[PDB]
Paper text:
pmcSterile alpha motif (SAM) and histidine–aspartate (HD) domain–containing protein 1 ([name]) is a dNTP triphosphohydrolase ([name]) that hydrolyzes dNTP substrates into their deoxynucleoside and triphosphate (TP) subparts. First, the enzymatically active [name] tetramer is formed when dGTP/GTP and dNTPs bind to two allosteric sites of [name], A1 and A2, respectively. In addition, [name] [name] activity restricts HIV-1 infection in nondividing myeloid cells. Here, we investigated the structure and functions of [name] [name]/H mutants, found in colon cancer and leukemia.
[name], found in both colon cancer and leukemia, and R366H, found in colon cancer, are located in the enzyme's catalytic site. In the catalytic site of WT protein, the R366 guanidinium group neutralizes the negative charge of the substrate dNTP γ-phosphate and interacts with D506 to stabilize the bound nucleotide. For both the [name] and R366H mutants, we crystallized the HD domain of [name] (residues 113–626) in the presence of dGTP, which is capable of binding both allosteric sites 1 and 2 as well as the catalytic site of [name] (29). An established catalytically inactive mutant (H206R/D207N; SAMHD1HD/RN) was used to prevent hydrolysis but retain binding capacity of dGTP during crystallization. Crystals for [name] and R366H diffracted to a resolution of 1.9 and 3.6 Å, respectively. However, unlike WT protein structure that displays dGTP substrate bound to the catalytic site, no nucleotide density was observed in the catalytic pocket of either mutant, thus confirming that substitution of a cysteine or histidine side chain at residue 366 renders SAMHD1HD/RN deficient in stably binding dGTP at the catalytic site despite tetramerization. Uniquely, when dGTP was modeled to fit the catalytic site of R366H mutant, N ε2 of the mutant R366H side chain sits close to the γ-phosphate position in a modeled dGTP-bound structure and is therefore theoretically capable of an interaction, which could explain the higher relative R366H enzymatic activity for dGTP versus other mutants. R366H possesses significantly lower dGTPase activity than WT but is more active than [name]. It is possible that the substitution of a positively charged histidine residue at position 366 is able to mediate minor coordination of the negatively charged γ-phosphate group of the substrate dNTP, whereas cysteine cannot mediate this interaction.
Numbering used by the authors:
A (entry chain C), B (entry chain B), C (entry chain A), D (entry chain D): 113 to 277, 284 to 599
């Protein structure tokens, strides 16, 4: 077997080592062809047809590029082809755990269907990787190309999910610490996964990408930091790193958290919950699983993709009627109606455990407007979105090491004041979107009154359209006037 | 209801009239989200994730652009908003008839499954359009925006499939003849459908586009030709028009007729044929249809998409075992092996009626080589591909009208000799690809000997790798030496 | 005479009205072919070969696009083709006043050569426009295409420089106030000039533009604000407007204020000052002007371009030896050496009249380090750069009017807190770059010590490389560590 | 002292070895900043502001890419860093010999000014390279980085101009023959110089490039051909190679041989001829040269750039009045008027010796039309353009070696019939453009009659607009009817 070339629209001609080809040509990997990268986003951005499969190839490619470039610039690092292949495999395989419509499945569906369980795509990726290796006799092939399966499978899993539990990693020692910063960077979030989707999502969405990963790679070096060898950026590049996170935030606002994209994801999740008792997925030993339980058996999970959406939509079973009708409403674009958006003020943060109480609170508000219809908790959806620079309220640039032209081996820190006074003072916030399941002109008018009243009651920010949608409510609040 | 904006990666911000929105937001239209533009092409170009739906939006947009630009430059044409909307709807809806994996369904599957029937995606588009209109109460909405359903539905169908059957059209008179040249140009093949997929397919494939549709539109005018008003191009654009067809041919060789893309389409078609007796699709009145018969009932056809591939792949029914195993082999990349390509010489053209005889002919060849295994007709696939400039052997530029700067209202013809002696002397040819279902080293060696012998016997062109794959065979033929 | 088409790499096919063609085809306009958009930037970004000429065509085009789009969406505005042509001419002509190397001439050279005079490129553009009109008999051509020269020439000049010599404008009344916001927006800086150079500079520099002007135009409307008709943006676009200024700041940091680009501009300015007594430029009546006085006669200024650089570089006159030697040093790349960058802390602002005292201050600093060479005021250059959102310390988004979907005719304001807590808290800052004219290793070491000491003395920010370039100095300051 | 990074819009971040930096930072190299790549093309495509300097950096970069990729894939080639640097320097320096407005100088001006001399930009590049090396003490720096000046300077010159004189090269032996195919490919014209300008010119012109050099590099290998090691392409890539030359032809038609671009180059050449007696350029020992004689002294040639255009345009000397007036007419766009284009039929080829007789022939034609004005030889310009695939009438693909996947070390040939019957039957042709120096309506009408009559007399092709511009003439010729 020899190397294969793939032509990617983002990266151009990608060379794949024969071991990588063997991992890719499995049911467990090919499954990613049937999961949309941006899930419900496709229903708002018709260009966003792209699947997790091509994203995965790109992450593998970029992982290879970064590790190769470090090895070429700094031969003293003793980066081995074995190291390169392991970093490529981790890059290729870190998306294996995604379920139907990607972030909708682990972000929305599993939390509601299985509140007791703690599930992440990262955990899923490790389980599916193990299933891929074991089901397809990969370990012999790994040894053929000079890999140490016990050590290297551990190394690959650690790159994906972090320590599997003082140096906490078993796959590689402290002198190769920098290898763990490439595929999934737990220290500051600067990794090749972000670089691929920035470029790929933008290409498909019709938004332009402001971040130059190629420049970052050219200016990356490994330096000693606190007795670890770590990837350091050139001091001058600090502005571009702030801009990388700015780009991420912009993509979330414009696309990933698009108000309609989110409500379509919500409606699909509701359809999946109503279908969950009736859809059967055959796993290991012919045992039957549900959408919600396929995560417990990787053989079943292998066959759980966006297809479930079409199975429900095209079904005739009366049991699936309620689920089917929700998806049919999506096709007619009879969506739950966006009422508006607000933000908590100051340090106020809404907790996960409180999310279910929020619809009741909106319905409980007393507007001081004559209302045609009276709305109930069940008529409202409240979506809370945490927007940050990937480290909650921490500045990720405080967790980056830099080097200077005059001393390229010496790691330094750069503080925010050393860069620009025009940068963000805060690095996290919450967006609260409210929608109404009643699409009536009178119901929507009522929903707007409840919403703006709830905002005033809770001292949330004035909705941007507040003076138009609720002219009788907005005056009461002095902060808004 | 008001206009909606869609952000497309190819076209940027597209405005959609509310009537267009109502047509788009139907099960019959949204179905195109679940049919890949390039079918098996996605399995060779991982970027080609794009579906018929986003292509359809683009064709609608470009149809609007061309008709608007003509109206702005030449108010004397009396192009009406009613005309603009009808051209947009035809552009939007000309892809409605595509089936699973697009050209695979009407190009490969239906011809083999239902040899008696004459089926085209164009015919399918007209039937699905009628079903869309009737199922969703569109006619009242058409009248609301100033359309006359009887005349305008006729006009839209005629733009898609041509005369429904001396001016042969009923939807519009001879003074609006140019409107029929926009969406599906039967005269010379220069239409907005080609312009969208050139740009869209290239964007996704990773291949570059060498055609400027925007320039064509800027230089397009309507002039009188033989008592018809027709779209004329500026004389100096003739080179760019030859290049447009050159681009089309390049995309076919590189992507649409990729040898592996074609064999994957062949293998999927074979799986569909083996599954056809057992897959049931519920149509009108709860009646059950097969993959092959869903084309007879638009309610059933509405639910026939690429999903059928996954229904088969994920099935447990023993009846579907043979179909399922073919798709599983695709996932393992255990594909039928490409043996080589040849061309007929001179005028020789192979017709469909003896396509089935070609595998037997290859197996019947007697290469003067000692062979380990002896191969049978059933072990060979022979794929014949007609490559042309869209009008069989004819030069489409002989069917284009031009105008000169000094007389912009006066239509002229331009001959090939007036342009360049570097242009093609022929405008059609055939490619013959041969594959072997036996994938072992000995069988592949034997297949290569049979193939090159068959080429020599039939006076076909010397395979490019002929001297390497069959060094004992190639010397016999003097034309090759 | 009819419309001409120009193919621009940024905008594609641009249509130019015959009146626009007549203005463009003059010595006064064609002169912009010989002035680089980014001046010294070309010597750092080899792609930045682009001249003011092609920028001007783009500004004219975009001015036309915006005014046309407003007129199409809101016919009630009664925008006339006379209005469209006047806005296009202003867009085309607002760059006519630029001198050699663009911002270097009005930003650096004229302030030093002629401190008494107040000169701007805007004033220059008005003078050159008048000279263009009068020298080329344009007024008759304006009348031929329905313009009224007296009113319309006033309107065009007002669009370029603002109120010519209570509604302060004479060219158009308050009901056409929005027309003054297109070409040069004095209210908030959102104008088509910025949109062209963002896209054009990025195309040439090799950095990507993430501002979407086309989307802005689609969402622009005219609404009543304080008894004026003004351009309003859609409320939801507020994020993209913050991002537009973010983009502008990024382009300044990365390119326009590149430390080496700036020093090359400084060195060229110094060469021009030393050549100013000796270069003669023939103006009106054969009278002779200097580089510094050509601004006083538009006939002379017509012949003042980047060519002056080459006239000096290629000169043999002993009088020009000092000027010539500076330019020759640029070619050998031995330029003045960058020592470092610092910022004033908090609100501290360095005044224009204090700039010349700063080199003396650096030379006067007493670093507690043993020094091989002692440097003098003349050996230092101190460059102060004001970085802002185009309205000094003011937030330009406080000066933008928005509209909501539910009330598209009703203008609203949006405050920073209503948008995001991640946005800048400040909208202006100063960067201070220090360079040394002595390039030897010993002199550069000394320059670094003086610089970091000066920073500590003045409580400026710690240079990013401070611990490397001045390890003995940095410890003294506790704020730095 | 270390590598420098340059951000190029085409190639992104380019790394330059310190030796390359030293060669670049010289008057002889920096001179290329003041010569437009496409000369008069800028006066038709305002985007084409790009200079020979940035093209040169790109050619150096791509030369490096190809040699590096071959070395990585085939270590057995024993490609050395010394080899890599020499190939990069040749790539960087092969444009050093270009004069004002690039191809205008060696294509039009020198042939007319100095008919006795044989001058090429390639010869100029070798002379300027020698001058660069000797003037700037480069030889010591070459030795510092492991080059052997005697052998390596020979090798570099040979890559640029071919043998300086059975193996005809002295710089490297037959086992490194493939190195001579990278920078300037005399065998088939497939070189990195073409790859850079295709991408760079397209970026600036606003035309799209359909050639993928990156793919070519990935599929390039070295194989033995007739006892030489040569670069071979993968068999499958033959289509893309035909397309590469198709792209080159398209760029020539659309841009490089644009009818107006060519006439502006003609008018500038005429201005240079009229100025040649009076412009003085100081060379070595203070000796004075003319535009036409600066090629004899590299010190003088160093100072001969596009600036000469502005020196003439801005001059006051009465001696330069005639030259100055031609350039002033260019600014007013009072260009010689395009009359039309024709082609010789069959094999007929117009010789260089005959070019001057062609204006007389047009003026001598007797159109059967009543004419207001009678035109003379001096009133006509006849421009003859040879359009080919870079090897006159030969197919360059007949001069390419390929390899097959089954035998990657075995070189093969591919014939045209093995590829496609849709490819060109001829690989060279001539375009004849005619212009009139008399621009008035009556003179232009007369010029059109003479031109179309001359075409009929000489059995040239029917002008595209023939029936519009000469309706009385076209009928006489029955080949045209
Ligand atoms: N731009 C372009 N890409 C192509 C063309 N033909 C194939 N590709 C792309 C599609 C796939 O990503 C890949 C096809 O495989 P390669 O050509 O790299 O060769 P390989 O030997 O790996 O596979 P193969 O046997 O050719 O299918 O390259 C072509 O003519 N042009
Ligand atoms: N390039 C770009 N595209 C955007 C941006 N924001 C949204 N888009 C895309 C998403 C959609 O395809 C289109 C605009 O859709 P909207 O965001 O207005 O969504 P929708 O129509 O559901 O909202 P609305 O009717 O205004 O409540 O453009 C942006 O800032 N930049
Ligand atoms: N992409 C492309 N651009 C072209 C081509 N020929 C010219 N251009 C450029 C030159 C100009 O900037 C622009 C269009 O100008 P034209 O020369 O076509 O002018 P116009 O239409 O007035 O025609 P004319 O020259 O009077 O026959 O496009 C071509 O074949 N392709
Ligand atoms: N893409 C990109 N290119 C940039 C940026 N800033 C500068 N460039 C360009 C300028 C140069 O052509 C190249 C890198 O040069 P540098 O910025 O490193 O400048 P320089 O070598 O003077 O810096 P140094 O001496 O190392 O401090 O990229 C940026 O933010 N993004």
């Amino acid at each position: 077997d020899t190397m294969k070339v793939i032509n990617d629209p983002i990266h151009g001609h990608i060379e794949l080592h024969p071991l990588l080809v063997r991992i890719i040509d499995t049911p467990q990997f090919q499954r990613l062809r049937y999961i949309k990268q941006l899930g419900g986003g496709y229903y708002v951005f018709p260009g966003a047809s792209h699947n997790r499969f091509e994203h995965s190839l790109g992450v593998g490619y970029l992982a290879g590029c970064l590790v190769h470039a470090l090895g070429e610039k700094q031969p003293e690092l003793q980066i081995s082809e074995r190291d390169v292949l392991c970093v490529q495999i981790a890059g290729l395989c870190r998306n294996l755990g995604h379920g139907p419509f990607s972030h909708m499945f682990d972000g929305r569906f599993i939390p509601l269907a299985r509140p007791e369980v703690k599930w992440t795509h990262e955990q899923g990726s490790v389980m599916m990787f193990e299933h891929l290796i074991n089901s397809n006799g990969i370990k012999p092939v790994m040894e053929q190309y000079g890999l140490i399966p016990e050590e290297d499978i551990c190394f690959i899993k650690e790159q994906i999910v972090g320590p599997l539990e003082l140096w906490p990693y078993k796959g590689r020692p402290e002198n190769k610490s920098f290898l763990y910063e490439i595929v999934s960077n737990k220290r500051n979030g600067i990794d090749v996964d972000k670089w691929d989707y920035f470029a790929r999502d933008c290409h498909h969405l019709g938004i332009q990408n402001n971040f130059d990963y190629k420049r970052f790679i050219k200016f990356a070096r490994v330096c000693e930091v606190d007795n670890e060898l770590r990837i350091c950026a050139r001091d001058k590049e600090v502005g571009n790193l702030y801009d990388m996170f700015h780009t991420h935030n912009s993509l979330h606002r414009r696309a990933y958290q698009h108000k309609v994209g989110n409500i379509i994801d919500t409606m699909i999740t509701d359809a999946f919950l109503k279908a969950d008792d009736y859809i059967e997925i055959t796993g290991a030993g012919g045992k039957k699983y549900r959408i919600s339980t396929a995560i417990d058996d990787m053989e079943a999970y292998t066959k759980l993709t966006d297809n479930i959406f079409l199975e429900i939509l095209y079904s005739t079973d009366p049991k699936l009627k309620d689920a089917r009708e929700i998806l049919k409403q999506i096709e007619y674009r009879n969506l739950f109606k966006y009422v508006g958006e607000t933000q908590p003020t100051g340090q106020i943060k809404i907790k996960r455990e409180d999310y279910e109480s929020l619809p009741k609170e909106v319905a409980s508000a007393k507007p001081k407007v004559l209302l045609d219809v009276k709305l109930k908790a069940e008529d409202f959806i409240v979506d809370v979105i945490n927007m940050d620079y990937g480290m909650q309220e921490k500045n990720p640039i405080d967790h980056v090491s830099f080097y200077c032209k005059t001393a390229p081996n010496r790691a330094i820190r750069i503080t925010k004041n050393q860069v620009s006074q025009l940068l963000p003072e805060k690095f996290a916030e919450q967006l609260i979107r409210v929608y109404c399941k009643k699409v009536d002109r009178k119901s929507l008018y009522a929903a707007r009154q409840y919403f703006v009243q709830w905002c005033a009651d809770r001292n949330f920010t004035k909705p941007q359209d507040g003076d138009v949608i609720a002219p009788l409510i907005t005056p009461q609040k002095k902060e808004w006037n």
